[PDB]
Design an enzyme around this catalytic site. Sequence first.
Site, PDB file in Angstrom:
ATOM      1  N   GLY A   1       1.198  -1.276   0.115  1.00  0.00           N
ATOM      2  CA  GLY A   1      -0.433   0.629  -0.064  1.00  0.00           C
ATOM      3  C   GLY A   1       0.722   1.539  -0.361  1.00  0.00           C
ATOM      4  O   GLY A   1       0.224   2.405   0.128  1.00  0.00           O
TER       5      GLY A   1
ATOM      6  N   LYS B   1      13.524  -3.197   1.193  1.00  0.00           N
ATOM      7  CA  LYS B   1      12.431  -3.056   0.203  1.00  0.00           C
ATOM      8  C   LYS B   1      13.205  -3.391  -1.215  1.00  0.00           C
ATOM      9  O   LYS B   1      14.064  -3.642  -1.746  1.00  0.00           O
ATOM     10  CB  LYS B   1      12.717  -1.494  -0.078  1.00  0.00           C
TER      11      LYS B   1
ATOM     12  N   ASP C   1      17.060   0.401   8.521  1.00  0.00           N
ATOM     13  CA  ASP C   1      16.655   0.534   9.832  1.00  0.00           C
ATOM     14  C   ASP C   1      15.761   0.853   9.538  1.00  0.00           C
ATOM     15  O   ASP C   1      14.478   1.625   8.735  1.00  0.00           O
ATOM     16  CB  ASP C   1      17.705   1.990  10.073  1.00  0.00           C
TER      17      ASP C   1
ATOM     18  N   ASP D   1       8.948  13.526  -4.116  1.00  0.00           N
ATOM     19  CA  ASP D   1       7.825  12.739  -3.594  1.00  0.00           C
ATOM     20  C   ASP D   1       7.467  13.088  -1.885  1.00  0.00           C
ATOM     21  O   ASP D   1       7.336  12.147  -1.039  1.00  0.00           O
ATOM     22  CB  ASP D   1       8.488  11.645  -3.836  1.00  0.00           C
TER      23      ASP D   1
END
Lengths: 289, 244
Positions: free
Chosen positions: A21, A41, A87, A132
């Site tokens: 999400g 990620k 982290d 962003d």
Amino acid sequence: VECPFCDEVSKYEKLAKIGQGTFGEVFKARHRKTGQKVALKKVLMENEKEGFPITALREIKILQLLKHENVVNLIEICRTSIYLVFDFCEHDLAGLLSNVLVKFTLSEIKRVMQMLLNGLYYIHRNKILHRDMKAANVLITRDGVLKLADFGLARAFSNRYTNRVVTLWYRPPELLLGERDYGPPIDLWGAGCIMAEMWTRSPIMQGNTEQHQLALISQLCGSITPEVWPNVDNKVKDRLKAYVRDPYALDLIDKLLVLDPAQRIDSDDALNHDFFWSDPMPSDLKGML
Amino acid sequence: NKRWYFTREQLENSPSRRFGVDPDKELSYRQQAANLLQDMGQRLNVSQLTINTAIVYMHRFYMIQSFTQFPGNSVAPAALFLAAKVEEQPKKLEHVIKVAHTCLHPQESLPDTRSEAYLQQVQDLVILESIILQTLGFELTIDHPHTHVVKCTQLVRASKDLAQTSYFMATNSLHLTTFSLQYTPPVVACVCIHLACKWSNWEIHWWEYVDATVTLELLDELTHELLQILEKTPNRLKRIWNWR
Ligand SMILES: Nc1n[nH]c(N)c1/N=N/c1ccc(O)cc1
């Protein structure tokens, strides 16, 4: 094949998608030896026709550079796919703002904005635009330390930059007007929107198309005018008066959400704003959490 | 910080040395890869900076990997393909394969881009690019001496000439030596300026303002090593020779 400097991601134990999400595949995970919590990620490879994504390269290049208390921390890069390991940070401004049980005191709002503006001052100082800025990309650690995250659209600056930047609701006039010679002021406009969001608990301007955003912006900041914004052609306080009330907070928000980017306040002067230097002084994040 | 800097003894026991590649042979393998990168880079119309980055990637890669298991002719294109992305002059995968092919096989003819053998050489490059990233541990930000050459040659007020010879020395140090594996870019830049001064009979200490570690003892040792390989390189010195 030897590999001294890229560890297998198996060193971490996957706990929970948190989540798709949030722009993609990020997992909370646990170092198998120390329990240290991290964020994994994955570097997504669908429709990656040109080898290792040039985008992963920028963000990795950038995160490796940016080392600061208010910027997310890249620990290492792991293989098996490829994973960026960060982290872990328990909260994110968006989650906290959308949770009715969470309550910020004026003293705490100052501190959140102070950390944010300091992260921006730093990244800009390093010739990086985040591009962003939005509440959901601002993290706060379990101990109340704010971190800017998601540098996947970030890029170095020093111009024909890309105009497909910044989530619509946080996107500044320059960009919506098709500007390609922009700089650090674009991040600050987003900083404006997030600040106001600290009281309104919801993004001040929720457009549906690029033009719907521009109309909305005008219904707040006055209208785009060559008198207001020299060379452009090529009610802020009343609507926020309700939620905010404090004189100083309202004024900075007015100087962040300035139409002309060159008249829009920067990270250095905002940190200086009396808002951070009058009572109640900015305070640590304890009871908010 | 000393991860990608090696002592002369570390350079002797290189991965390649372990599979019986002589010291001298290993340099050739390195110099030949730098040529392939330089040739491809010029044809692909990338900057010298991008070419340089790829050369450093290659140098470092062979401190971890062996030439006997990864050939320069495979690694060069991948390093260059990667360095172009990293340096923001992305060249397309097919394009890099096509140019690499012409450099390595002037007389051959590109396979049908639909063939299984071509789809495969594309796949090999991508795999090799991935191995480079992991071998380098995703450390892609390279500092090159050229930044610093410009710096000294201004802060000693050299003729355009002297300054151009220094850039030339700097570029050639990358192709011809493993200095980039032993000395920081500021030292290498001092070395190049020093030899350029010697070569032009210019006399300007200047280097103490550039790097605190640098000694004349070291400068002369290094310019000598560099001048020698330059003397061993056909036509290379002709380029800076005053013929008047
Ligand atoms: N949601 C999260 N909790 N902890 C994190 N590090 C986290 N996300 N971190 C990120 C996410 C995206 C990114 O480009 C860089 C850091």
